[PDB]
From a paper:
Adenomatous polyposis coli (APC) is an important human tumor suppressor protein which plays critical roles in diverse cellular processes such as Wnt/β-catenin signaling, cell adhesion, cell migration, mitosis and chromosomal instability, and so on. The N-terminal armadillo repeat (ARM) domain of APC is the most conserved region among its vertebrate and invertebrate homologs, and mediates its association with a variety of binding partners including APC membrane recruitment 1 (Amer1, also named as WTX for ‘Wilms tumor gene on the X chromosome’), Asef, Sam68, and IQGAP1. By recruiting APC to the plasma membrane, Amer1 regulates the APC-dependent maintenance of intercellular junctions. In addition, together with APC and Axin, Amer1 promotes ubiquitination and degradation of β-catenin, thus negatively regulates the Wnt signal transduction pathway.
Intriguingly, ITC experiments demonstrated that peptides of Amer1-A1 (residues 325–335) and -A2 (residues 496–508) sequences exhibited approximately equal binding affinities for APC–ARM as full Amer1-A1 (residues 280–368) and -A2 (residues 380–531), respectively. Therefore, Amer1 residues 325–335 and 496–508 are regarded to represent the core A1 and A2 fragments for APC binding, respectively, although other conserved Amer1 residues nearby such as residues 315–324 may also contribute to the interaction with APC. To further understand the molecular basis of how APC recognizes Amer1, we determined the crystal structures of the APC–ARM/Amer1-A1, APC–ARM/Amer1-A2, and APC–ARM/Amer1-A4 complexes to 1.90 Å, 2.00 Å, and 1.70 Å resolutions, respectively. Despite possessing apparently different sequences, Amer1-A1, -A2, and -A4 adopt remarkably similar conformations when bound to APC–ARM, both in anti-parallel manners with respect to the armadillo repeats of APC. At all three interfaces between APC–ARM and Amer1-A1/A2/A4, four highly conserved asparagine residues, N507/N550/N594/N641 from the H3 helices of armadillo repeats 2/3/4/5 of APC–ARM function as rivets fastening Amer1-A1/A2/A4 onto its surface groove. In addition, two basic residues, APC-K516 and -R549, straddle the middle portion of Amer1-A1/A2/A4 peptides on both sides. They form salt bridges with a conserved acidic residue A1-D330/A2-D503/A4-E370 and make hydrogen bonds with the main chain carbonyl groups of A1-C328/A1-G329/A2-S501/A2-G502/A4-G368. Moreover, two tryptophan residues, APC-W593 and -W553, provide more binding affinity by hydrogen bonding with A1-T326/A2-S499 and making van der Waals interactions with A1-G327/A1-G329/A2-Y500/A2-G502/A4-G367/A4-G369, respectively. Furthermore, substitution of the crucial hydrophobic residue APC-F510 by a lysine reduced the complex formation between APC–ARM and Amer1-A1.
Author numbering:
A (entry chain B): 325 to 334
B (entry chain A): 403 to 738
The structure:
């Protein structure tokens, strides 16, 4: 399976 | 960190005033006519604005965490959402946006904070409810929080995210979003959530129109020429493809949306992410279906997959080879 990790706001 | 401490105390004081009002003004029960606290009366938006701005710096996040900043900000978001519901009031919308942005920053790479936030069941329900806000800017922010919480979710967090109905809410959100920026954040959140378990995969597939929509994302041409929508839409499709594979109705939706043809184009993309997603999707779709196997053969899939089996990338090498062997086990008569 795939995913895209975390993100910072904005 | 006296200034930060002061802002957090301001927020906590406001929450207490709200909780006290809530307690004295229960639904259907005897109440006086004293009005609900309004966040504007307590300069809440500027307080959350400063905290949000500080949260971009890891040293400030360290300080914020020592002071329990995540819990205070989450409590504030939850109480405003409970008190005022899906308001279009500008002040309330911006304060929710700022709170959500801070929560996104505080959960970035932070195992402990993700777990704490998921443990706040009332706040999780409030987050999910915000996906129906008429503000797409707020939707974007909320989807980023859920995206973070869905990444490397522990057992409790996975359960919580599912129990608050985040999967159906985000997929339903996606069908309606008009801004690309909002769509990007929502699909990214779904991408992470779709990996958790079969039930999340089923919930995505069960939303009327969702599969046709996701196939649509595979050829979406960005207003900013980026590939983010194709990557995330294709990522969701890859993750749910194991369930699609065993459902003839769902395979038919993919067929009428020219999905296999599109996936074969993706095999020749220059984007590692896109190729990796397409290999995983075809791995699943190439299994146990003579119709789609023959279609793949006729479209030249075998040649394309043979060009990928020697990839240095594990997912591409694994997926291309698995799809290839599925096809080689089921050669149509004319290819004997």
């Amino acid at each position: 399976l795939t995913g895209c990790g975390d993100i910072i706001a904005e | 960190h006296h200034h930060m401490l002061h802002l957090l105390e301001q927020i906590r004081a406001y929450c207490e005033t709200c909780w006290e009002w809530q307690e004295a003004h229960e639904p259907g029960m005897d109440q006086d006519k004293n009005p609900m606290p309004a966040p504007v009366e307590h300069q809440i938006c500027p307080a959350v604005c400063v905290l949000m701005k500080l949260s971009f710096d890891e040293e400030h996040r360290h300080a914020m965490n020592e002071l329990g900043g995540l819990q205070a900000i989450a409590e504030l978001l939850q109480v405003d959402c409970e008190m005022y519901g899906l308001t279009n009031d500008h002040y309330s919308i911006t304060l929710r946006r700022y709170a959500g942005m801070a929560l996104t920053n505080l959960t970035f790479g932070d195992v402990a904070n993700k777990a704490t936030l998921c443990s706040m069941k009332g706040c999780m329900r409030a987050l999910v409810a915000q996906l129906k806000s008429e503000s797409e800017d707020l939707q974007q922010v909320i989807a980023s929080v859920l995206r973070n919480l869905s990444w490397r979710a522990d057992v409790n967090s996975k359960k919580t995210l599912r129990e608050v109905g985040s999967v159906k809410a985000l997929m339903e959100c996606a069908l309606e979003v008009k801004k690309e920026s909002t769509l990007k954040s929502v699909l990214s959140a779904l991408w992470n959530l779709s990996a958790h378990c079969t039930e999340n995969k089923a919930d995505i597939c069960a939303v009327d129109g969702a599969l046709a929509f996701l196939v649509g994302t595979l050829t979406y041409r960005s207003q900013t020429n980026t590939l983010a929508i194709i990557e995330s839409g294709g990522g969701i499709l890859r993750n749910v493809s194991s369930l699609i594979a065993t459902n003839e109705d769902h395979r038919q939706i993919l067929r009428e949306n020219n999905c296999l043809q599109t996936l074969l184009q993706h095999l020749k993309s220059h984007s590692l992410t896109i190729v990796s997603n397409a290999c995983g999707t075809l791995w699943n779709l190439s299994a146990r279906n003579p119709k789609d196997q023959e279609a793949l053969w006729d479209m030249g899939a075998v040649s394309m997959l043979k060009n990928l089996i020697h990839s240095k990338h594990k997912m591409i090498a694994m997926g291309s080879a698995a799809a290839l062997r599925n096809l080689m086990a089921n050669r149509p008569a004319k290819y004997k």
